Amino acid sequence: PEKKWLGTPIEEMRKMPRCGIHLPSLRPSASHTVTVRVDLLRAGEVPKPFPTHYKDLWDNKHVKMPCSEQNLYPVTAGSRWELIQTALLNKFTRPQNLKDAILKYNVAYSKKWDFTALVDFWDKVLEEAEAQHLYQSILPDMVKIALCLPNICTQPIPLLKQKMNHSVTMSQEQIASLLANAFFCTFPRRNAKMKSEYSSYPDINFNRLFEGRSSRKPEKLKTLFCYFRRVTEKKPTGLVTFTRQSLEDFPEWERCEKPLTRLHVTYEGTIEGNGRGMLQVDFANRFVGGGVTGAGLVQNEIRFLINPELIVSRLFTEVLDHNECLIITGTEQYSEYTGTYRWARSHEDGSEKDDWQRRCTEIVAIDALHFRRYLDQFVPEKVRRELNKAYCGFLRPGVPSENLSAVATGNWGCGAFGGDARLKALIQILAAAAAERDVVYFTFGDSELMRDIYSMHTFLTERKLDVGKVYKLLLRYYNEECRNCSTPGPDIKLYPFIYHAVESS
């Protein structure tokens, strides 16, 4: 029988907080927006906002806040924020009450936004007492934090545009207020099909969670209301950092002399459960979070539900270009799940916090390409694209490699997305090697794949092939077995080809 895991013992892999650099003082800079009072930051205390009082920017470089005095609506032109306040400061006893409240400041979508799934959740899925608690406690508490937005998020939030290398660090409390607003669909300029300014950003308002008959919707709502119940009953005290990273220069893959690093590979366990303290790869959509606020539940998006603070990145994160990723440090897990997705129960996150009061949970969104024609991914241009995407996700400029955790990852962009698991494993191993990080690879039930990955890594390591030598083998595979292949896949597979090439010298 196959073993459960192979390679380096997982406990010998580096992880946070132990491996981490000494953090300098948290402070704003040209590359770092910090929305809280750093001098008053104290463990277990809700951070205070900086500035003390709301300051507004309504322009193309910052989030358009719903509480802006430039957020106008027909009443003459009147305050949409005052209308939002009046709409939401009402008693809800039936789901149509919530629908009508939300539509008061979204009149243009009165017909276009269906609320069938919300109605069904409220009346059919919840028991009478659960529904009562929803509308007597949770929803009014959600309204309170949402309408406190100008007192909570006092500092303009910059848009993380393409090509920006920039960080935003905000409190979990600030994020809660932002997400309560997203639930009540209050963010202006984020709704229209013909959107101009925000066409290159993901949806943020939660309207599409309320629509349709999908049996998935009630499980999404359960998971989000678990979060909203938690943060309203006990205000979170941590910080979260969102960093856009955009690299212009990449390794010279054909000549790279860096050695392969360590590997732990296993067909049991999960990235979030067993990669604690490690850099956790989110198998992302280029629109980060993908369809999380609307339809379907695909590769990675479950993470955005169980760590819902990740969702707020959609407010300010432009669609990722090929050379870009988003790194999120400090999100908390609020829910556990089974499966077929179903909310199981709440989660009490036990992670330690770093010196900036950020939970030791680092997630990187990197989007694989889709391969609608299988052989496309072996073309050198496409191998390099994926290498560079992974490398951007793994690299930490100016951080010594000894202070970097192992990368916790798995079958990135494979299955129905068209990626070949064995190629993608080797691509991630090479990118990790170039960024000088070890790899913890979860195959999620596939024990033969675990063995095949371990066997290849062992062979390449023992024969002392560096990144460049392995890349050259991938080029040979393309040129000799793929370029002229007239069938969907070649007769000789990649790993067998690599073994024979090296063994024949």
Author numbering: 442 to 516, 524 to 787, 791 to 956
Show passages lifted from the paper.
Reversal of PARylation is predominantly carried out by poly(ADP-ribose) glycohydrolase (PARG) in nucleus and cytosol, whereas ADP-ribosylhydrolase 3 (ARH3) may play a role in mitochondrial PAR degradation.
To understand what caused the activity difference between the mPARG E748N/Q and E749N/Q mutants, we solved the crystal structures of these mPARG mutants. Interestingly, while E748N and E749N mutants were completely dead, both E748Q and E749Q mutants still retained residual PARG activities. In wild-type PARG structure, Cβ and Cγ of both E748 and E749 residues are semi-buried. Mutation to Asn, which has both Cγ and Nγ linked to Cβ causes a spatial collision. Therefore, the conformation changes in this catalytic loop completely abolish activity of mPARG E748N and E749N mutants. To study the enzymatic mechanism of mPARG, we tried to soak the catalytic residue Glu748, Glu749 mutants E748N, E748Q, E749N and E749Q with the iso-ADPr, which may be the smallest PARG substrate containing the α(1→2) ribose-ribose glycosidic bond to be cleaved by PARG. In all above four PARG mutant crystal structures, we were not able to observe the electron density for iso-ADPr at the “active” site of mPARG. Our work revealed precisely how some of the PARG mutations (e.g. E748N, E749N) disrupt the PARG activity through significant conformational changes in the PARG active site.
